[PDB]
């Protein structure tokens, strides 16, 4: 489809997709000798993303920033493995996201999930300690002056998770939105909600994002770049899909169903898209957690 760019390589004059479209790392060209990365992928893609990076970046000491939307294992798994190969990089993440990397228990969960995704006999490169990452915490509303023609605003966007932020390039009307709008359904063209921490926060983040100057390019955590009407309408559509799921939950409960019934149906209808980077137990359990959240707050 012409409104979804979903191939590795160049996406715009300044922007490339590295790795797999399902868990991509974006590469911004900031100048002749300066680059940034956006989103932090899954650990097992280290050599793939590194190889792709080196096709565009002849000297990786020119990689100066790495912007991170949130602490989930599929959005920061590359950091310890590519860190050592990027001697000038500064990781830019929220305060709560940075805090997660200082927690032994939180780090354990991330490492276990990423290691479930290794192909057999696959060995990972030498890793920085999670608590030694070259991180700089960024605040809600902060302007990241990345280069002469790259200025991105941090916007708090809690709900999917309690640390989540998005990054807005107003010059290009371009929003890196992480998972805050949900998972874009490639077959049907609609947003699937991903409410895994707080429904009220998730919806209020979408209300605020809807107020941004009209979007031209919308870049979520999975699936590529959305443009045209999909970008312009994305936040509003994500919000109305979340409400649709609430009504659906209420309708079935009112017929005496357990949360497990709609959970299995959502896993069946939606779990196939992420099967290659998400353990299926996690998808089904995530569907259950989401319905538990919607059921409590509705």
Ligand X SMILES: O=C(O)c1ccccc1-c1cccnc1
Which residues form the interface with ligand X (CB under 6 A)? Answer: 72-74, 179, 183, 194, 196, 221, 274, 278, 282-283, 286
Q: CB nearer to ligand X: give 41 or 80.
A: 41
Q: CB nearer to ligand X: give 64 or 267.
A: 267
Which single residue is written with the structure tokens 């057999």?
120
On whether 52 is known to bind a ligand per the annotation, the reply is: no
Rounded (5°) CA angle 277-283-284: 155
The token pair that represents 117 in the structure block: 């995704």
Tell me how far, at minimum, the Cβ of 58 lies from ligand X, in Å: 32
Tell me how far, at minimum, the Cβ of 221 lies from Fe ion, in Å: 4
Q: CB nearer to ligand X: give 113 or 146.
A: 113
On whether 74 is known to bind a ligand per the annotation, the reply is: yes
Q: CB nearer to ligand X: give 64 or 72.
A: 72
Q: CB nearer to ligand X: give 65 or 196.
A: 196
Tell me how far, at minimum, the Cβ of 163 lies from ligand X, in Å: 12
Q: Which residues contact 126 (CB under 8 A, 6 or more apart)?
A: 81, 84
The C-alpha atoms of residue 73 and residue 111 are separated, in whole angstroms, by 7
Sketch the per residue contact string, 180 through 219, with Fe ion: x for CB under 5 A, - otherwise: ----------------------------------------
Q: CB nearer to ligand X: give 80 or 193.
A: 193
On whether 72 is known to bind a ligand per the annotation, the reply is: yes
On whether 283 is known to bind a ligand per the annotation, the reply is: no
Partner touching 283 among ligand X, Fe ion, none, CB below 5 to 8 Å by kind = ligand X
| Bridge partners, 226 (sequence order) | 4, 218
Partner touching 14 among Fe ion, ligand X, none, CB below 5 to 8 Å by kind = none
Is residue 179 within the footprint of Fe ion (CB under 5 A)?
A: yes
Assess contact for 177 and 166: CB atoms under 8 A.
yes
Is residue 44 within the footprint of Fe ion (CB under 5 A)?
A: no
Q: DSSP of the chain, one letter per residue?
A: -TTEE-SSEEEETTEEEES-TTS-EEEEEEETTEEEEE----GGGHHHHHHHHHHH-S-GGGEEEEE----STTTTTTHHHHGGG-TT-EEEEEHHHHHHHT-HHHHHHHHHHHHTTPPTT--PPP---GGG--EEEE-TT-EEEEETTEEEEEEE--SSSTT-EEEEETTTTEEEEETTT-EE-TTT--EEP--SS-HHHHHHHHHHHHTSS--SEEEESSS-EEEHHHHHTHHHHHHHHHHHHHHHHHHHHTTT--HHHHHHHHHHHHTTTTTTTS-HHHHHHHHHHHHHHHHHT-
Sketch the per residue contact string, 62 through 101, with Fe ion: x for CB under 5 A, - otherwise: ----------x-x---------------------------
Q: CB nearer to ligand X: give 113 or 154.
A: 113
On whether 222 is known to bind a ligand per the annotation, the reply is: yes
Partner touching 286 among Fe ion, ligand X, none, CB below 5 to 8 Å by kind = ligand X
On whether 150 is known to bind a ligand per the annotation, the reply is: no
Partner touching 35 among ligand X, Fe ion, none, CB below 5 to 8 Å by kind = none
On whether 267 is known to bind a ligand per the annotation, the reply is: no
Tell me how far, at minimum, the Cβ of 14 lies from Fe ion, in Å: 24
**Annotated binding residues for Fe cation:** 70, 72, 74-75, 160, 179, 222
């Amino acid at each position: 489809h012409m409104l979804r760019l979903s191939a590795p390589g160049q996406l715009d004059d300044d922007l490339c997709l590295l790795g797999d479209v399902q868990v991509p790392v974006f590469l911004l060209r900031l100048g002749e000798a300066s680059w940034a990365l956006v989103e932090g992928g899954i650990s097992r893609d280290a050599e793939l993303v590194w190889a792709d990076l080196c096709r565009w970046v002849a000297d990786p000491s020119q990689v100066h920033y790495w912007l991170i939307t949130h602490k989930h294992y599929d959005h920061c798994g590359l950091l310890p493995y590519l860190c050592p190969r990027l001697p000038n990089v500064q990781v830019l993440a929220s305060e709560r996201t940075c805090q997660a990397w200082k927690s032994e228990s939180a780090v354990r969960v991330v490492e276990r999930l990423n290691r479930q995704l290794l192909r057999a006999e696959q060995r990972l490169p030498e890793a920085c300690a999670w608590d030694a990452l070259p991180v700089r915490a960024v605040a809600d509303g902060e302007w990241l002056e990345l280069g002469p023609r790259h200025r991105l605003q941090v916007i708090e966007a809690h709900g999917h998770s309690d640390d989540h932020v998005v990054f807005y390039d107003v010059r290009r009307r371009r929003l890196f939105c992480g998972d805050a709008l949900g998972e874009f359904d490639e077959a049907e063209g609609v947003w699937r909600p991903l409410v895994f921490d707080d429904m009220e926060a998730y919806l209020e983040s979408l209300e605020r994002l809807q107020r941004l100057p009209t979007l031209l390019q919308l870049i979520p955590g999975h699936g590529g770049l959305l443009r045209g009407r999909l970008a312009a309408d994305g936040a509003e559509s994500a919000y109305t899909e979340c409400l649709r799921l609430c009504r659906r939950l209420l309708w079935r409960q009112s017929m005496g169903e357990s949360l497990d019934e709609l959970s299995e149906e959502l896993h069946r209808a939606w779990g196939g898209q992420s099967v290659d980077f998400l353990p299926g137990e996690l998808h089904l359990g995530s569907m259950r957690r989401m319905l538990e959240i919607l059921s409590r707050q509705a």
